């Protein structure tokens, strides 16, 4: 599923991604605008060391979920890579949420520095109530 943009700014508030360890959603907006392009079966393949990117936060398959074809991977979210290319979104926002557990933060993704870090990231939310 390709979203709209209030649409998706809409659903990550009810998930609770609003503030989420201290990162506003308009943050994660701009995260999965570049990442995916708001794309929920958006797949990249990293040929240089075999790893997968899945979902609409593109997260990989050498730390972040389970697709059994990446070498010397673990898997913190605890969920197969398939569980991250659905429509609902459920389970890609549930690991997005575990990666910013960890001491990077929102900066675990590099995506994020280049295209979102000290820019005016309000228009990802502007005009979507919430």
């Given at each position: 599923k390709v979203f709209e943009r209030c649409e998706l700014a809409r659903t990550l508030k009810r998930l609770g991604m609003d503030g989420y360890r201290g990162i506003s959603l308009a943050n994660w907006m701009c995260l999965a605008k570049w990442e995916?392009?708001?794309?929920?079966?958006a797949t990249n393949y990293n040929a240089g060391d075999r790893s997968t990117d899945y979902g609409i936060f593109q997260s990989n398959s050498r730390y972040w979920c389970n697709d059994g074809k990446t070498p010397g991977a673990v898997n913190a979210c605890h969920l197969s890579c398939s569980a991250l290319l659905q429509d609902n979104i459920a389970d890609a926002v549930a690991c997005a949420k575990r990666v910013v557990r960890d001491p990077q933060g929102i900066r675990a993704w590099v995506a994020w520095r280049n295209r979102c870090q000290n820019r005016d990231v309000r228009q990802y939310v502007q005009g979507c109530g919430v």
């Amino acid at each position: 599923k390709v979203f709209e943009r209030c649409e998706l700014a809409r659903t990550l508030k009810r998930l609770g991604m609003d503030g989420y360890r201290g990162i506003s959603l308009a943050n994660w907006m701009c995260l999965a605008k570049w990442e995916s392009g708001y794309n929920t079966r958006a797949t990249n393949y990293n040929a240089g060391d075999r790893s997968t990117d899945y979902g609409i936060f593109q997260s990989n398959s050498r730390y972040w979920c389970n697709d059994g074809k990446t070498p010397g991977a673990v898997n913190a979210c605890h969920l197969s890579c398939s569980a991250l290319l659905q429509d609902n979104i459920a389970d890609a926002v549930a690991c997005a949420k575990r990666v910013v557990r960890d001491p990077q933060g929102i900066r675990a993704w590099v995506a994020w520095r280049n295209r979102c870090q000290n820019r005016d990231v309000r228009q990802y939310v502007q005009g979507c109530g919430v």
